[PDB]
Amino acid sequence: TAITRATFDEVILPVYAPADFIPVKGKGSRVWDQQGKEYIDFAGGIAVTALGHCHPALVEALKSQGETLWHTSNVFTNEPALRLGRKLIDATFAERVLFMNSGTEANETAFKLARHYACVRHSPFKTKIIAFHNAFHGRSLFTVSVGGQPKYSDGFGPKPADIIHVPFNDLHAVKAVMDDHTCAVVVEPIQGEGGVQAATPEFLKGLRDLCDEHQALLVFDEVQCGMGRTGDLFAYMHYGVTPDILTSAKALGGGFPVSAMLTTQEIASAFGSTYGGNPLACAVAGATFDIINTPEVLQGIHTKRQQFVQHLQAIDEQFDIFSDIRGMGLLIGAELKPKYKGRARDFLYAGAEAGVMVLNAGADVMRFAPSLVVEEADIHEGMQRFAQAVGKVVALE
Amino acid sequence: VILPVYAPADFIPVKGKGSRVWDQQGKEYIDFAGGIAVTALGHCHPALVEALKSQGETLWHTSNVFTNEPALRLGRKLIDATFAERVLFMNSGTEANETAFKLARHYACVRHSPFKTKIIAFHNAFHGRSLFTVSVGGQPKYSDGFGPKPADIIHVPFNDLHAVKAVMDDHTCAVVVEPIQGEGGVQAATPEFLKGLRDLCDEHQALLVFDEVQCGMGRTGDLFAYMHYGVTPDILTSAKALGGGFPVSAMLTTQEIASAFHVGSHGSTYGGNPLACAVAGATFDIINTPEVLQGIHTKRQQFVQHLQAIDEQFDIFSDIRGMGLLIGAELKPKYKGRARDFLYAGAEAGVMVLNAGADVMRFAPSLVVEEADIHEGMQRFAQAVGKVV
Ligand SMILES: Cc1ncc(COP(=O)(O)O)c(/C=N/OCC[C@H](N)C(=O)O)c1O
Ligand SMILES: Cc1ncc(COP(=O)(O)O)c(/C=N/OCC[C@H](N)C(=O)O)c1O
Ligand SMILES: O=[N+]([O-])c1cc([N+](=O)[O-])c(O)c([N+](=O)[O-])c1
Known part of the structure; x- marks a missing residue:
């Protein structure tokens, strides 16, 4: 009777294809799965947990x-x-x-x-x-x-x-x-x-x-x-x-x-x-x-956006993967260059493996929608994890 | 025209416990409506x-x-x-x-x-x-x-x-x-x-x-x-x-x-x-x-016996129907179109009930509503009926 990822397929209509791990607890922008692995949350449950977890x-x-x-x-x-x-x-x-x-x-x-x-x-x-x-x-x-x-x-x-x-x-x-x-x-x-x-x-x-x-x-x-x-x-x-x-x-x-x-x-x-x-x-x-x-919170959203965007720019300088960084506030889209067209899901999966939760916005765009009060320390840790994931995907090129 | 049921400004629920609800003025009501059959285990x-x-x-x-x-x-x-x-x-x-x-x-x-x-x-x-x-x-x-x-x-x-x-x-x-x-x-x-x-x-x-x-x-x-x-x-x-x-x-x-x-x-x-x-x-x-599913049948009969006693006294219902704790009581032709009035009279008497169209009273209380609340609420509803007729 253990609940596993396999349980999803036995229970829910096949309209989702969820991640291989199951978040069980969260505080702020950090989340833990059933094995106690810790993730940085830049997805927000699709821009929902605007003040983080609990x-x-x-x-x-x-x-x-x-x-x-x-x-x-x-x-x-x-x-x-x-x-x-x-x-x-x-x-x-x-x-x-x-x-x-x-x-x-x-x-x-x-x-x-x-x-x-x-x-x-x-x-x-x-x-x-x-x-x-x-x-x-x-x-x-x-x-x-x-x-x-x-x-x-x-x-x-x-x-x-x-x-x-x-x-x-x-x-x-x-x-x-x-x-x-x-x-x-x-x-x-x-x-x-x-x-x-x-x-x-x-x-x-x-x-x-x-x-x-x-x-x-x-x-x-x-x-x-x-x-x-x-x-x-x-x-x-x-x-x-x-x-x-x-x-x-x-x-x-x-x-x-x-x-x-x-x-x-x-x-x-x-x-x-x-x-x-x-x-x-x-x-x-x-x-x-x-x-x-x-x-203060509304000002911080702009500060935090720039912290994310600087990291995305650094990632692109190193790995040459993005053609555009767009959105407003803490809705961020990063469009993949034609070389990586259609591969947003590959980066999302590598992201999850590296311990960071991100989104897609179609197959060509990475999307970030973190808590509006996401701590700077979590922005830097999660974006280092994302850089590591990008590195692992690009090394295969 | 079909009139909705809305509470006036002087009836705003603020607290619920079990099958009892209190408004901003501290008036206590017995809840036989369950927010329209939602609070099946009562409040809080x-x-x-x-x-x-x-x-x-x-x-x-x-x-x-x-x-x-x-x-x-x-x-x-x-x-x-x-x-x-x-x-x-x-x-x-x-x-x-x-x-x-x-x-x-x-x-x-x-x-x-x-x-x-x-x-x-x-x-x-x-x-x-x-x-x-x-x-x-x-x-x-x-x-x-x-x-x-x-x-x-x-x-x-x-x-x-x-x-x-x-x-x-x-x-x-x-x-x-x-x-x-x-x-x-x-x-x-x-x-x-x-x-x-x-x-x-x-x-x-x-x-x-x-x-x-x-x-x-x-x-x-x-x-x-x-x-x-x-x-x-x-x-x-x-x-x-x-x-x-x-x-x-x-x-x-x-x-x-x-x-x-x-x-x-x-x-x-x-x-x-x-x-x-x-x-x-x-x-x-x-x-x-x-045990809960059995109790739903026991409780239904407690409500139905009250509804029958109300009908014996006031001659207002043509039919009592539904299943379990979904209860309908259809008004006699003499009271066609009066369901909203019985509902509002109920509220004045401290009991919350429903309609099911303009000719039908409806009850959808907590599945675990206490027998004491059934009797008290139905006595209040009988009083409300007396005010209407
Ligand atoms: C602009 C905009 N408008 C309406 C909705 C619908 O909101 P919902 O019913 O709360 O999911 C959404 C919801 N988006 O959610 C992501 C898609 C969702 N998971 C799905 O597959 O339906 C939205 O982004
Ligand atoms: C058989 C049946 N099917 C669906 C619904 C709607 O469910 P809901 O969206 O959970 O309210 C209901 C809901 N009835 O509640 C009353 C009405 C409500 N205030 C409204 O007008 O939507 C139902 O009885
Ligand atoms: O703060 N916490 O609630 C918390 C919870 C879990 N967990 O496994 O569900 C952790 O692994 C950690 N942790 O690793 O620091 C913290």
Whole structure:
């Protein structure tokens, strides 16, 4: 009855191919497997553990609320949800906040709301949604159809219709497809899964102007780039472009399943300042928000980015593997040179062997999404491990 | 118009212990609603609090780049206790249903034909509020107004086997059914209907999908309602009681069906995280015991005897139905459309209850609700009824 890696194949649907070792415990940016091997975590559970593992403040919030009240249905509100709603409203453009569990659910509510607002405020025929190639918005049938990767939306029967995809950063293409029958433009300000590609300023500003012209809602999916990831509370604040609806998840709860959809009173009235929210989830997300939304933590994200980028540059000087280093704050993408095209997974595996956890963003890009408070010592140790992994792969060349 | 139920500003739950809840003013309520059949072991159950806190000190989240011990331990328990051979964990019943419906579609696509896409579902069904799940749900008012719905979904009346036979064909990929429709008036499938679905799915090579989000995890007095009926589905979904108040869900199926998915066919950031799975494991360990499952039947009769006594005094119910601790009490025609008013009257009297449409009262208390709480809460509900009538 020992639980091993082999156990996964006997138990879970074959939709994942997980690592050969099993993390069992973590503190900060260090993680231990069943053999007590120690890893440096630059993956963050895919940009989720924004304050690292078992952060004392988050554990305290969990325990305190866990002794008090876990659950209310959406018939009720609860103090943690009201508190978190207020902090989001005070800190952002939002006047109304709806809480869910996952990024997928938050996006379902955002896309349903944009559709419904158009239906009741303009016309039942105003249904087109513009989205972008390589976008990722979740795995429900609707959200994966708004997602821009046909490989993930093919094969589930008839897709919800009236979704049009154009290239990310192509403002002319958006202009071309938008019209009075368009209800929404949905965009990630930085495409995380899609190779860590940031919107240009002109593109994002252009989406706002086109949404205004056509009476469409601009929906920012900040599930991955939000909650401090870029070094601002939300990426829209870096750009100075205010969306009509914004979604947040991943870092919002520091690891606890929680998500949010933020909008205005005018738009939300198509459906008090908050709706939903698990008491336990919202208590934890409140503690997370209180730490991430501080000048010091947000400044540190930029300091830490440069510490990572200097190491990636040193690695490239030595080994000649990267064509581009991009992203914002502590979402970092390092694109492999053509010689190593398609081999991101080879470097991820060698990384894991060397004791560092990193991500891909497609087969050509390495992705780093560490805790926003990752200690400098852990940045240097993990990046030395990564350099060692790169060395081992390159020596085979 | 269908009116929702919302609490006013003067009713904000702040604390729960067992089957008792207190609001901001310190008013105490007996909880016969369970947050809509979620807190199946009541509020802040010591074993669940212990699981939460101990795993909370250890590991919360690693993503599905990794597997984790609590998830594999919970999957093993679900596999051992049910027809399932493989599982996927998600964060809500809606997400588990999305996974099930996508799996049934994809299985048909790759095993039979990309054209085998019809899904048969039932009027008054509830499967969640995502665009796909609400379109499979059987309340048009809830699926209207969001632009183009995912196609190839056909609705017929619950419990009408003939109608299912009439619409099913070789182009049908699935029949999706709640063994008891919870939101839809607490209506249980008849034995003939449920077995009929299994036979029709076999005939047409379609997958039978049971949504046990509300009726599963002990709610009926068996671990899953399918066990009461002795009809085994191809895919089953579970949530709510599974995590006792922690957001977690599961989709259960066989290896043969699971194998239609490949790496990257579906996924979830949070789904299967060790904190959720540690909590659901603790919940499962308590609910899946002979003693708790027996007690659910004892407790059902305690509630039903109270409901009958209320009816003898006030003449308000035409029918008392459901299974285990999912209880429906249909209002007589004289009280048609009054379920919300009885619910609000209950709250004033210090008891939290549910509706199941405008004509039906619903009860979904903790599976371990104390006999003393059943009697006190039902006395409060009788008082509320006296205020209404
Ligand atoms: C921009 C953006 N929007 C929405 C989502 C969906 O969030 P989720 O439902 O919480 O997984 C995501 C989630 N990405 O997660 C990685 C992929 C996931 N593991 C999968 O395979 O589904 C995202 O990056
Ligand atoms: C048979 C059945 N299937 C799926 C669900 C949805 O599960 P959830 O996403 O875990 O709430 C449910 C949930 N019912 O809860 C009530 C409604 C809730 N407030 C909502 O409107 O989504 C169910 O009864
Ligand atoms: O701090 N710790 O909780 C901790 C835990 C483990 N472990 O194996 O789970 C270690 O190996 C170490 N360690 O190696 O320092 C530390």
